[PDB]
Amino acid sequence: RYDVTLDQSDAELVEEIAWKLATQATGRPDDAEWVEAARNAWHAWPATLRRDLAGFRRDSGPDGAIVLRGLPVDSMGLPPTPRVNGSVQREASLGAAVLLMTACGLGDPGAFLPEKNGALVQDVVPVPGMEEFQGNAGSTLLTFHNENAFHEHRPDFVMLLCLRADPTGRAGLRTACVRRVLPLLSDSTVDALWAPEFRTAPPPSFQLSGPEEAPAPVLLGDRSDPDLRVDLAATEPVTERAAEALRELQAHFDATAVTHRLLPGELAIVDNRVTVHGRTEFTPRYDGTDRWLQRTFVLTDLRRSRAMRPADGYVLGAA
Numbered sequence: 001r002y003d004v005t006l007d008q009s010d011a012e013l014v015e016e017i018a019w020k021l022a023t024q025a026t027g028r029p030d031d032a033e034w035v036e037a038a039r040n041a042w043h044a045w046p047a048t049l050r051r052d053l054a055g056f057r058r059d060s061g062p063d064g065a066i067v068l069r070g071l072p073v074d075s076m077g078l079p080p081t082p083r084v085n086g087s088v089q090r091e092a093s094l095g096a097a098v099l100l101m102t103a104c105g106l107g108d109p110g111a112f113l114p115e116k117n118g119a120l121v122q123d124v125v126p127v128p129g130m131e132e133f134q135g136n137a138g139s140t141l142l143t144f145h146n147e148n149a150f151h152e153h154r155p156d157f158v159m160l161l162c163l164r165a166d167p168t169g170r171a172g173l174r175t176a177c178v179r180r181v182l183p184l185l186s187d188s189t190v191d192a193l194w195a196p197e198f199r200t201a202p203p204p205s206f207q208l209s210g211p212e213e214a215p216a217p218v219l220l221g222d223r224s225d226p227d228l229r230v231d232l233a234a235t236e237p238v239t240e241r242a243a244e245a246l247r248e249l250q251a252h253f254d255a256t257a258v259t260h261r262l263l264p265g266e267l268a269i270v271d272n273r274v275t276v277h278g279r280t281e282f283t284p285r286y287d288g289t290d291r292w293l294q295r296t297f298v299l300t301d302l303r304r305s306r307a308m309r310p311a312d313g314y315v316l317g318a319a
């Protein structure tokens with residue numbers, strides 16, 4: 001129940017709902033009125049899909065991820081893949097519709113002002129000159145991370161909708177769940193990961209060489225079913241045992257990861273409380289045919305971040 005292919009009937013209904021939202025709803029995706037329309041439209045989805053999503057929200061399973069297949073994307077109408085840094089989806093579209101409806105089903109959408117200018121629907125596309133970036137515009141191997149790990153109100157879910165697959169065949173999303181990793185880790189590493197000996201900075205998407213947060217543990221919550229907070233690029237160990245812990249953690253992420261090559265109309269939803277993600281190295285063409293995902297973050301309890309959301313909006317900033 002973590003790999004869901006829409007049947008023809010459900011696929012046609014969601015298509016209808018997404019078109020209606022994209023073409024008839026007033027305003028544009030970042031407007032509160034559009035998110036409200038998306039929230040109402042979500043409740044028109046077939047019960048089967050709403051039940052699937054509700055089940056995943058309640059229990060994201062041993063891999064902490066779900067992939068839905070057969071969602072609407074306008075492949076014939078799709079323009080060349082953007083090649084600019086900071087690319088975001090400001091205009092109404094089927095992709096924005098699918099993402100924002102689903103976000104309202106799982107919680108609410110949200111974004112962070114310093115990243116992709118706080119857009120609710122963000123492009124994940126390779127950008128010339130950014131090949132070596134540990135982030136959405138890169139094409140070198142992207143290390144495993146919780147999304148925006150530094151942040152107190154980091155995404156609860158990360159949703160990635162494929163508009164255009166990587167035509168080269170080398171790119172794949174990788175997800176690794178701590179539920180697979182924990183039983184395999186050495187006792188010394190587990191003890192290390194519970195200790196406040198790890199310091200984490202914002203990812204480069206926020207800025208370059210940003211200020212690191214205070215030292216804290218990687219593992220959080222329940223001893224048997226913990227959450228985690230780590231970024232193998234942005235998390236610095238404060239002690240020697242923390243360094244070894246990170247090395248062993250990395251090895252087990254690699255060993256336990258599931259690799260997904262997404263196709264158009266496929267939506268991966270990663271539970272960011274328990275699952276890290278990364279991406280394989282690939283060689284972009286930079287000819288408008290490259291990999292194109294759109295990404296929306298979900299906050300399961302938007303209320304918690306009110307102090308960071310002026311006018312009770314969907315964009316989180318300082319204090």
Ligand SMILES: NC(=O)[C@@H](O)[C@H](N)C(=O)O
Nearest residue numbers: 135136145147148203205
């Ligand atoms: N480390 C991360 O969380 C990255 O995915 C970052 N949000 C980015 O878009 O590059």
Ligand SMILES: [Fe+2]
Nearest residue numbers: 145146147277
């Ligand atoms: Fe990420």
